[PDB]
Amino acid sequence: ALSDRLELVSASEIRKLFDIAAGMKDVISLGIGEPDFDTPQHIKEYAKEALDKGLTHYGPNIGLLELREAIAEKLKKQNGIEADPKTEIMVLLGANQAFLMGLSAFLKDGEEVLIPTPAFVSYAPAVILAGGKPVEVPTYEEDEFRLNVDELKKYVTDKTRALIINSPCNPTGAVLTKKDLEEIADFVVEHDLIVISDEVYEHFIYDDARHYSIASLDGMFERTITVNGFSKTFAMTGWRLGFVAAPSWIIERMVKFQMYNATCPVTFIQYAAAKALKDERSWKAVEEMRKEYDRRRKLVWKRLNEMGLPTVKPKGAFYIFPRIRDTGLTSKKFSELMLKEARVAVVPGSAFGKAGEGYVRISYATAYEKLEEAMDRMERVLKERKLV
Amino acid sequence: ALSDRLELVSASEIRKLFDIAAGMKDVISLGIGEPDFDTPQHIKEYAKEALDKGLTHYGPNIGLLELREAIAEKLKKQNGIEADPKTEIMVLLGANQAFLMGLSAFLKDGEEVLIPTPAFVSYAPAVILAGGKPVEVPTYEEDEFRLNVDELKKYVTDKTRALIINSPCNPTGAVLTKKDLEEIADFVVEHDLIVISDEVYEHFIYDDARHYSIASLDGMFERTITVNGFSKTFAMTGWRLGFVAAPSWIIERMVKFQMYNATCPVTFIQYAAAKALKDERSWKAVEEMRKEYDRRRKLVWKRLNEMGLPTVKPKGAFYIFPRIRDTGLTSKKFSELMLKEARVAVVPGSAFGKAGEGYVRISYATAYEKLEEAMDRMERVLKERKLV
């Protein structure tokens, strides 16, 4: 039963870090998994307009049609994904809902779900809650943390039914290239898996990197649940609005699940997001945010490396994952030390899976000045403790 | 797995009704279970203020402390329930989320959950999804659909673990008396059950009915999950905001589940609700809504009985459940006929459980003028078909 599965889910290491950091002052948090920017004003204005228009009643379990149509257009233009807004697109209370609900549309007892690690903290627990068995597939820093099909093939079994992909990736910041996705797609097809693609950080890509969606690849829509949302893209984390595009049979089961869960997303919020998707100001805001994230990203990448922590330059999202194993400390002890002496909160790499052990996650979704200060604090401790 | 459980949950008779009635012209809908009133303007203003305050980021999984504190005050004053806002009160994306997540805090494989019927449609499916077995316990017209403990006694087994009660009740409008609850409390303690009490319609009570909360009774807090929310009370259905008060051990498990579900409720919406709870104008609006609901209630009760359908006068919520079995038609056939010929959509009582068969649910949460017309149309068809 669900209660048994919930008991199998381990307590959060990020939760533990927060509880401790909170009880201390002068601490700079680098464990934030959300934008620091406020929601663009014009979007706030669209929400106010929706409130004046009286859009405060229930909407379809699947989401407002107007929003689904706006999402279909965004998917087509930006991602090359063709999805019918009437049956293949569902709005959710944040993109986070997609994993538990999406997997519940097909996952059977004991079936395995390949989860490339380091991985976002929601994946494994969602698999366990759905009734399956999570199977971690390590990614390596020498591969810029890009998932390698060589690794997937070693961990796949006859019990494997799904694969969860995340690009741009949280916590590594890795971006899967088109060739990477083509190879993953072939593997997915070969093993008759359903692949869930988490693309919420799609717009925060840097350097020469481009965002490709696996569902846009030849014959992939029939076996892909594309997950995205407005939380990162429009700095709307507190608005709780995400969405998925998938075959209608999966969508039908997801709305059925929703009928006994959150029912439907916030009506006036959906109206604002539909208007936001078609407003040039929304995208100009996305560009400004990406620019600032990039400025902070170059700061932390250079500082981490120069202070003695080999760090892969992230190509997407707003996270960076420095190697800390050479200091002789475990990810947890490294985080404990930084919180106590540097007054800087970083997430132990192990929180993202075994492959994350030996690393630590730092989020640069915070003021540049705060980042400069946290870098100095961290470097001070590393050098004083002779860890570098 | 969840997918198998989901496959076991039967398709919704309500959506089937809504699908058909969707394309039909001139249909007066009496099957919508939500306030027709718009959200009070002052509450809309608090949300706009929250947007101006930049409350658009993540909030705690358990909800905004300010809102939890406001809820603790409301629960104490209005319900006599003493709950610690820091550990025993959780804010949700609508009260609907409480059943699946609340049950998942303890329900084991095959454990039975007593569900007095006619009952709200989310109960049985939530039990099934959680991994248990829903057991319907009939309530009767002669008892004004108030649950009788002697009936519960017929269904108890060694496997019984919980009971879900709803007062005021949807679809019957039944309100459990203080003595009903005292008797139910005894049975719950006797069998070491956890009782979930859905009190979302508490403010819409009429005649000599009064709202008691089972959790407020002697030693009941330790085994009760009180469910409530703002959807009905403040006409905030599209805002998706509800809550529960329960022992911390239950709350911890519900917050853990939320981490892999919707994460947290809408931040600016929670702020608006916290302020709304302490605003005198909110209760003024509630009273205004209750009086209007009462006006509509007397109209539909008079009309239904006088047209030939024996109907218990409801004492709470905004639903009325006329007896249709004497027409010789089933609930579904009666509903079909009304939609086809009267162009009025009513929900077949069977959608609320086996004990709902022979009845039909009507929602009077719609313009008084629309109700009059719907009553006339229904009466005309009953008379033409000599069903009455």
Ligand SMILES: Cc1ncc(COP(=O)(O)O)c(CN[C@@H](CCC(=O)O)C(=O)O)c1O
């Ligand atoms: C990779 C990824 N997928 C989904 C989500 C959920 O975002 P939603 O749209 O707001 O529900 C996340 C986001 N964020 C945090 C975890 C949740 C939180 O409230 O902090 C994180 O990155 O750890 C990510 O990353």
Ligand SMILES: Cc1ncc(COP(=O)(O)O)c(CN[C@@H](CCC(=O)O)C(=O)O)c1O
């Ligand atoms: C008895 C009862 N409990 C909970 C809810 C859910 O309210 P929310 O999640 O706070 O908005 C309800 C409400 N409503 C409907 C079902 C869903 C819909 O959109 O109509 C019903 O009455 O059938 C009730 O009734």
